Design a protein around this nucleic acid. Structure first.
Ligand SMILES: [Mg+2]
Ligand SMILES: [Mg+2]
Ligand SMILES: [Mg+2]
Ligand SMILES: [Mg+2]
Ligand SMILES: [Mg+2]
Ligand SMILES: [Mg+2]
Ligand SMILES: [Mg+2]
Ligand SMILES: [Mg+2]
Ligand SMILES: [Mg+2]
Ligand SMILES: [Mg+2]
Ligand SMILES: [Mg+2]
Ligand SMILES: [Mg+2]
Ligand SMILES: [Mg+2]
Ligand SMILES: [Mg+2]
Ligand SMILES: [Mg+2]
Ligand SMILES: [Mg+2]
Ligand SMILES: [Mg+2]
Ligand SMILES: [Mg+2]
Ligand SMILES: [Mg+2]
Ligand SMILES: [Mg+2]
Ligand SMILES: [Mg+2]
Ligand SMILES: [Mg+2]
Ligand SMILES: [Mg+2]
Ligand SMILES: [Mg+2]
Ligand SMILES: [Mg+2]
Ligand SMILES: [Mg+2]
Ligand SMILES: [Mg+2]
Ligand SMILES: [Mg+2]
Ligand SMILES: [Mg+2]
Ligand SMILES: [Mg+2]
Ligand SMILES: [Mg+2]
Ligand SMILES: [Mg+2]
Ligand SMILES: [Mg+2]
Ligand SMILES: [Mg+2]
Ligand SMILES: [Mg+2]
Ligand SMILES: [Mg+2]
Ligand SMILES: [Mg+2]
Ligand SMILES: [Mg+2]
Ligand SMILES: [Mg+2]
Ligand SMILES: [Mg+2]
Ligand SMILES: [Mg+2]
Ligand SMILES: [Mg+2]
Ligand SMILES: [Mg+2]
Ligand SMILES: [Mg+2]
Ligand SMILES: [Mg+2]
Ligand SMILES: [Mg+2]
Ligand SMILES: [Mg+2]
Ligand SMILES: [Mg+2]
Ligand SMILES: [Mg+2]
Ligand SMILES: [Mg+2]
Ligand SMILES: [Mg+2]
Ligand SMILES: [Mg+2]
Ligand SMILES: [Mg+2]
Ligand SMILES: [Mg+2]
Ligand SMILES: [Mg+2]
Ligand SMILES: [Mg+2]
Ligand SMILES: [Mg+2]
Ligand SMILES: [Mg+2]
Ligand SMILES: [Mg+2]
Ligand SMILES: [Mg+2]
Ligand SMILES: [Mg+2]
Ligand SMILES: [Mg+2]
Ligand SMILES: [Mg+2]
Ligand SMILES: [Mg+2]
Ligand SMILES: [Mg+2]
Ligand SMILES: [Mg+2]
Ligand SMILES: [Mg+2]
Ligand SMILES: [Mg+2]
Ligand SMILES: [Mg+2]
Ligand SMILES: [Mg+2]
Ligand SMILES: [Mg+2]
Ligand SMILES: [Mg+2]
Ligand SMILES: [Mg+2]
Ligand SMILES: [Mg+2]
Ligand SMILES: [Mg+2]
Ligand SMILES: [Mg+2]
Ligand SMILES: [Mg+2]
Ligand SMILES: [Mg+2]
Lengths: 48, 221, 116, 121, 118
RNA sequence: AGAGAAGGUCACGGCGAGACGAGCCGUUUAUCAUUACGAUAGGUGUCAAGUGGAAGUGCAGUGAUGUAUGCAGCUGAGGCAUCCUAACAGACCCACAGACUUGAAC
RNA sequence: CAUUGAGAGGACCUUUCCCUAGUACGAGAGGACCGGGAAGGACGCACCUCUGGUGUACCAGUUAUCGUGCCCACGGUAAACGCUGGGUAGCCAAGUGCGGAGCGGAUAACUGCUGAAAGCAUCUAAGUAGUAAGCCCACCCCAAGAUGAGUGCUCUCCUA
RNA sequence: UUCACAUCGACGGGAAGGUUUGGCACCUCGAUGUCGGCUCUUCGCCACCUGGGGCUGUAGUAUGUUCCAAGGGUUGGGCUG
RNA sequence: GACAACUCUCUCUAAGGAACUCGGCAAAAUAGCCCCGUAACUUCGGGAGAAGGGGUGCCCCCUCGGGGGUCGAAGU
């Protein structure tokens, strides 16, 4: 099956923005993790 | 769906076999209970628009409950409970918030019950398993096998129908098993033995009501 | 599906996964602490503990059962020396799992499994 | 669990050595003959110079299965072969003497057959 | 005061002491030649006697099961008895056979000789 | 603007829930002294269950092998106990007494 | 948190046999309507106590061969079990349960009662009575994105 | 047997349908393609069974014909492209 | 990593056993070795490994194949 038409500019921008939103949730995990290693109290975690 | 009588809730403990004097073996589900089956709230036709009684079931540590809910059970004067449910009657005069139900007083022997529960989730299931589709030919040349088949007619109508049966998620739902029978009640262990299967694996949550018989327990319409 | 199938697959077939686990535990007993993937660690717990609990009893029977798991004899004998000393009071639970930064190559979650 | 094309041994005098089942009767649209069901069979092998000729269409009742019969005692029964007994449309066995064990589960519909039996289970 | 998993196990132990009280049940394993007497719901006069070898024993609770094989009139019959059943009256070990398995299912493929009793 | 409402998401231990999200349960593991609610997972200990008689050492035998020690040994995806490991450290969103009109009441 | 239910779906299926009664009916041979009772079929909803299937978690035999120094004993390989014999939990059916209820409502055909237009008659023009596996409610799941976004209980709105 | 109209209904007439064999050539030619099975539907009613009826040349059982009714059902094989 | 549908490469499947299908297509079955036995038909070469049956592991003993023992559900 092929694409009978070509995908319009704006719709494509919406789909790719959806794929860019996962970056937002990743940035939240990363931030929380940083604030956890920034106290040096975690015994479950280790860095070198 | 007005319900005949008050029901209680219970936990499915799993099945065993149970003899009768003449050596008839009946398989039975054993339904245990926990601290609960307390009337929480009562709803009058005036106030709520209809007649119903809300029973709570499972006890719980206080922390685990949320502030709105805890406030809901403080208004009752009852202990903290995990599951609330509603039974819908035609006459609510016998019930007062904080009252307690005993399943020994609502269920005798040889009585008919109705067991509602949640089903085992089987996940995302194919056409075969979910709808009993016959499977196509396994060997002479055929490439189909467990596949769905054709899903509609030709140019006309030229789209698939609503509700046309397809692979999707199977199980994991409120199911009601009508007209069961109570074989034996044990006071010592506070347990009820019911002939046959009830939905869900042990540790489930069940709802038992006295059976709705469409002629004689219910409003005619 | 799986309901109540409790085993760790590690994305390997049975044969390889067995051999993998044997290997990883001889490493753990030889070095005392190692770095792996969180999955491999969580899977490896059971077999570590099997070996330790094995050596707590010490019988020629038990020792033969350990020899037929671990790859290197030397490590097994060392175990049957050390363990009654080091673990005598600990009733179960001989491993620590301390997780870390993920791997650069694939972003596989890592972890540090320690012989406690 | 006799079903069409199944081959059976005959349990009586009637002079059929072997039956091939073609139909189950009285069960509506069922596909399974189990013990106590009437099946239409045909004769495959016969005992020579007997009133029965091979390639005959006849009625028989299934008295033995390799599938398992469940009584209410919790008791279960499983034989080593499938066998039937050739009857009339009256319930009377054509042959007059029966081999092998049978069950008390046949006592309701067939009297004759439980009577002529060497053993009852 | 009984916790729930406890309840499920407990009910079987109660059932089995209750049944072993009325009618004590023998030590019975695979490879045991055995005679059983059933009280049939029809015929008060004679309690059915089944002889035969024990090919298997499945332990579960009140429903623990025994599988007796015997050759009868040239037709092999296996029967499955719930052990604590009220309809069983007497059960006894006639003789013991020396066997290396937990289930003799291979007795179907062997000769009739091995299933022949009484 | 500081702070972090009720609650939510994340994180962390999970599942009889699950393609992913979602759902559900947990997150210092109580006290008790008369009920029940504070063990999520793994481990360890015991129990059901399976398999079917371990290794070692004895005896018998020219030997293959049998027999005793012993319902053994292994296993235990199931129960029940016990905090021994890991549920550490924590992070993010979020708090105009609820625009305007009209009756009614006071 | 708990629910009302507009709307939407699933399901309301069918066969023998037995009482009624060898009663009506008929010279006999034959043999009922109506209403009760059981067993089945197909289909649906669950389920794992039993009977099993698989069960590359496990346990046992066993062939070839290479390891562990050698005997003993174990480990590897014989694709994704070397080959066999068993199997718990799961999942599953051939196994186990359960379902199809309504002196509810309104009709089609039809049978009717009062009864005119046509001082007779007429089931119809007024008005009504019976009655269908059909239609609609009841049964079972979903369901307030039902933007017409419902109702109920409780909770929270700090500091300067 | 009497009796056109229980059931048949000759000689002729008036229709509907659009499933047969056709006429037409409006249609697409580039890669818009015929008959059977498998799987999977769905709809029509001119009703094969199951629900209710009228008439019978319906004693009863079973029919015949017709009225309303499309909710459900409509097997497994030997033989054929 | 996880362990959905589904497709593919594979192992197994109760009772039945070609009912499948255009068609036993694909799978399953058989299999080595020694011993007994071996048809119509024939161009007298064949057919023929026809078909069909038995035996088979590991130990001792005898003769240079036979007897005795012994495990296993099953011995190329
Ligand atoms: Mg809640
Ligand atoms: Mg699931
Ligand atoms: Mg098919
Ligand atoms: Mg294919
Ligand atoms: Mg269109
Ligand atoms: Mg991969
Ligand atoms: Mg391998
Ligand atoms: Mg373990
Ligand atoms: Mg069993
Ligand atoms: Mg807050
Ligand atoms: Mg979430
Ligand atoms: Mg999580
Ligand atoms: Mg914390
Ligand atoms: Mg635990
Ligand atoms: Mg647990
Ligand atoms: Mg030994
Ligand atoms: Mg071994
Ligand atoms: Mg010696
Ligand atoms: Mg045991
Ligand atoms: Mg504690
Ligand atoms: Mg800790
Ligand atoms: Mg205001
Ligand atoms: Mg204003
Ligand atoms: Mg609701
Ligand atoms: Mg509605
Ligand atoms: Mg809508
Ligand atoms: Mg509806
Ligand atoms: Mg109805
Ligand atoms: Mg009479
Ligand atoms: Mg009737
Ligand atoms: Mg029925
Ligand atoms: Mg089962
Ligand atoms: Mg079970
Ligand atoms: Mg098996
Ligand atoms: Mg199983
Ligand atoms: Mg070497
Ligand atoms: Mg090996
Ligand atoms: Mg190698
Ligand atoms: Mg190779
Ligand atoms: Mg490999
Ligand atoms: Mg196997
Ligand atoms: Mg059933
Ligand atoms: Mg009317
Ligand atoms: Mg009339
Ligand atoms: Mg008049
Ligand atoms: Mg009149
Ligand atoms: Mg009118
Ligand atoms: Mg009516
Ligand atoms: Mg009706
Ligand atoms: Mg009906
Ligand atoms: Mg709302
Ligand atoms: Mg509005
Ligand atoms: Mg006319
Ligand atoms: Mg043209
Ligand atoms: Mg095209
Ligand atoms: Mg019509
Ligand atoms: Mg009719
Ligand atoms: Mg008629
Ligand atoms: Mg007549
Ligand atoms: Mg119809
Ligand atoms: Mg229809
Ligand atoms: Mg139809
Ligand atoms: Mg895979
Ligand atoms: Mg292979
Ligand atoms: Mg099979
Ligand atoms: Mg078989
Ligand atoms: Mg077979
Ligand atoms: Mg055969
Ligand atoms: Mg054919
Ligand atoms: Mg043929
Ligand atoms: Mg065919
Ligand atoms: Mg082939
Ligand atoms: Mg092959
Ligand atoms: Mg072979
Ligand atoms: Mg040969
Ligand atoms: Mg030839
Ligand atoms: Mg041979
Ligand atoms: Mg031999």
């Amino acid at each position: 099956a092929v694409p009978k038409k070509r995908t319009s500019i704006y719709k494509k921008r919406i789909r790719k923005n959806i794929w860019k939103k996962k970056g937002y949730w990743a940035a939240l995990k990363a931030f929380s993790l940083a604030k956890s290693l920034s106290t040096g109290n975690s015994k479950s975690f280790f860095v070198r | 769906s007005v319900d005949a009588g008050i029901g209680v809730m219970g936990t499915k403990l799993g099945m065993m076999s149970f003899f009768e004097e003449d050596g008839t073996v009946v398989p039975v589900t054993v339904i245990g209970f926990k601290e609960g089956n307390i009337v929480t709230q009562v709803k009058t036709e005036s106030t709520d628009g209809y007649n119903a009684v809300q029973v709570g079931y499972e006890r719980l540590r206080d922390r685990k409950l949320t502030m709105p809910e805890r406030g809901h059970l403080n208004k009752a004067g009852v202990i903290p409970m995990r599951h609330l449910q509603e039974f819908r009657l035609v006459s609510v005069d016998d019930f007062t918030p904080s009252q307690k139900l005993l399943f020994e007083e609502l269920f005798k022997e040889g009585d008919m019950v109705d067991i509602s529960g949640t089903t085992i989730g089987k996940g995302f299931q194919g056409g075969i398993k979910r709808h009993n589709f016959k499977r196509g030919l396994m060997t002479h040349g055929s490439k189909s096998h467990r596949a769905l088949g054709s899903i509609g007619a030709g140019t006309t109508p030229g789209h698939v129908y609503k509700g046309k049966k397809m692979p999707g998620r199977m199980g994991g739902t409120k199911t009601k098993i009508r007209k069961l029978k109570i074989m034996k009640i044990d006071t010592d262990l506070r347990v009820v033995m019911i002939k046959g299967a009830v939905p869900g694996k042990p540790g489930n949550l069940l709802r038992l009501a006295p059976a709705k018989i469409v002629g004689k327990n219910i409003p005619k319409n | 599906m799986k309901h109540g199938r409790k085993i760790h697959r590690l994305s390997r077939p049975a044969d390889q996964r067995r051999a993998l686990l044997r290997g990883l535990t001889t490493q753990l007993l030889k070095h005392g602490r190692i770095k792996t993937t969180r999955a491999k660690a969580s899977a490896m717990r059971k077999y570590v503990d099997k070996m330790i609990t094995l050596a707590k009893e010490g019988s020629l029977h038990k020792r033969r059962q350990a020899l037929g798991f671990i790859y290197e004899k030397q490590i097994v004998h060392a175990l049957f020396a050390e363990v009654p000393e080091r673990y005598g009071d600990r009733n179960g639970g001989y491993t620590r799992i301390i997780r870390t930064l993920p791997r650069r190559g694939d972003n596989a979650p890592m972890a540090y499994i320690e012989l406690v | 669990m006799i079903q069409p094309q199944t081959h059976l041994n005959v349990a009586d005098n009637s002079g059929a050595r072997e039956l091939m089942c073609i139909r189950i009767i009285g069960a509506s649209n069922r596909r399974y003959a189990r013990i106590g069901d009437v099946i239409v069979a045909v004769i495959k092998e016969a005992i020579p110079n007997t009133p029965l000729e091979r390639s005959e269409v006849i009625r028989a009742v299934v008295v033995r299965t390799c599938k398992e019969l469940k009584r209410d005692n919790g008791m279960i029964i499983r034989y080593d072969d499938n066998a039937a007994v050739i009857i009339d449309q009256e319930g009377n066995p054509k042959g007059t003497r029966i081999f092998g064990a049978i069950a008390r589960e046949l006592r309701q519909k067939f009297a004759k057959i439980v009577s002529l039996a060497p053993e009852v289970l | 005061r009984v916790k729930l998993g406890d309840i499920m196990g407990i009910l079987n132990k109660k059932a089995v002491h209750a049944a072993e009280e009325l009618r004590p049940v023998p030590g019975i394993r695979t490879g045991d030649i055995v005679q059983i007497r059933l009280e049939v719901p029809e015929n008060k006069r004679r309690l059915s006697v089944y002889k035969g070898i024990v090919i298997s024993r499945q332990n579960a609770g009140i429903h623990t099961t025994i599988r007796i094989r015997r050759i009868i009139a040239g037709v092999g019959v296996e029967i499955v008895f719930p052990l604590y059943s009220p309809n069983i009256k007497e059960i006894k070990v006639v003789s013991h056979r020396k066997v290396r398995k937990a289930r003799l299912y291979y007795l179907r493929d062997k000769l009739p000789r091995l299933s022949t009793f009484k």
